[PDB]
Amino acid sequence: MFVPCGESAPDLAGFTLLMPAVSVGNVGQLAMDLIISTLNMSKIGYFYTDCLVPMVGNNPYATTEGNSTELSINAEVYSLPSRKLVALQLRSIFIKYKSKPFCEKLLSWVKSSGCARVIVLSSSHSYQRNDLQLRSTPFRYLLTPSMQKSVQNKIKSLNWEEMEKSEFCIRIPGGGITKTLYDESCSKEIQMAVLLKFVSEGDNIPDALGLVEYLNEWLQILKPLSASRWKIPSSWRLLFGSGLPPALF
């Protein structure tokens, strides 16, 4: 389920897993790309699996010339030992009846590695939103019962808004795999946190910036509150593609 880049097979005991749960508009993927680019996180392995559709291309974070010519895949995992953060990066879409196998594989991998506090950066639909949620902040958080109490008190001090679950079924209209991820994580009894935001489809870079700031409010991996806050990947060029034909204008 997890193949290291070489033969190192890094251990992730006591680390913190980060993933971009496939959101409405890949807001989680954009936020994870921002985090990886800002923290200069190197790929330690590949999360090769049948569930994610295949893709290839040059690494999003070209930076130098040598690093520019490195080939990336659909699911590459980056890690840096300084902050004890391991960041998985899904770069593709899911296949039908393939979310549950991926969730099971990821939960097994994180349990075996030893990492705790799986951060699930996701997003929900902004139109399947209640009036109270409409007038309130779009950001929501979800905590598993097994999650350590100290961080729960930290977030309570931060005064965040818990995701409204309705009897008490916790349904995320736009999470994608987030709901079943939460269910299976609760079944497996491992610490995990879900960070979502009510978004729509379109230009979602502001949504990704808001999500990374929301994550910062808890993790505090960067300064509290600016210019070049989060470094954007070099591959975020041409969000639309091609150019303007000359005949029209």
């Binding site: 993927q29 893709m55 999003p60 990336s72 879409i93 990947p233």
Partner: protein, 193 residues
């Protein structure tokens, strides 16, 4: 870096990034779902041959009509959706009779095919209040007839383009039948051959 579920296959009036209209191509696929019809154009006449797919012996073989008479000198072989074929055949017959009434002469096979094609391109472009062809026709026709120019064989496609063909095959086995035809067909072949 992230894949997208960009879809352009649903709208008939939607262009793909390469300019392809996917609904027309799916109509072509519907043609590919039909039975094989073979039409050969020679100097001694035209030959339209199609296969009857008889699901059960109880069904009358004569009821499965796929080669019809547009006019005394025009015939048509269909392949694809049967009812669309029926509508197109009715249009062709009405057009031929109108031409005879107006000009007191037989309508050219090319003219009949052109009229049927003009009917077979009104998907989101008829601009007429009456209910038009919302979806492209799902049948391909082989208008094989003999006129003053001699034997003729025209192939009509769901897109609405009619092209004169010396020997054409349309249906499930269209490609193999076409290969066999081009392997065997020669200009100076007889009708019996």
């Amino acid at each position: 870096m992230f894949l997208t579920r960009s879809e352009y296959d649903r709208g008939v009036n939607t262009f793909s990034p390469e300019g392809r209209l996917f609904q027309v191509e799916y109509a072509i696929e519907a043609i590919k779902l039909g039975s094989t019809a073979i039409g050969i154009q020679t100097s001694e006449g035209v030959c339209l041959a199609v296969e009857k797919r008889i699901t059960s012996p109880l069904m009358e073989p004569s009821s499965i009509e796929k080669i019809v008479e547009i006019d005394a000198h025009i015939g048509c072989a269909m392949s694809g959706l049967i009812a669309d074929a029926k509508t197109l055949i009715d249009k062709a017959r009405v057009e031929t009779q109108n031409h005879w009434f107006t000009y007191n002469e037989t309508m050219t096979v090319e003219s009949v095919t052109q009229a049927v094609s003009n009917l077979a391109l009104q998907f989101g472009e008829e601009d007429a209040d009456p209910g038009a062809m919302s979806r492209p026709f799902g049948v391909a026709l082989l208008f094989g007839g003999v006129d003053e120019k001699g034997p003729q064989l025209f192939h009509m496609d769901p897109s609405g383009t009619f092209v004169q063909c010396d020997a054409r095959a349309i249906g499930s086995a269209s490609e193999g039948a076409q290969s066999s035809l081009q392997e065997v067909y020669h200009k100076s072949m007889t009708l019996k051959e």
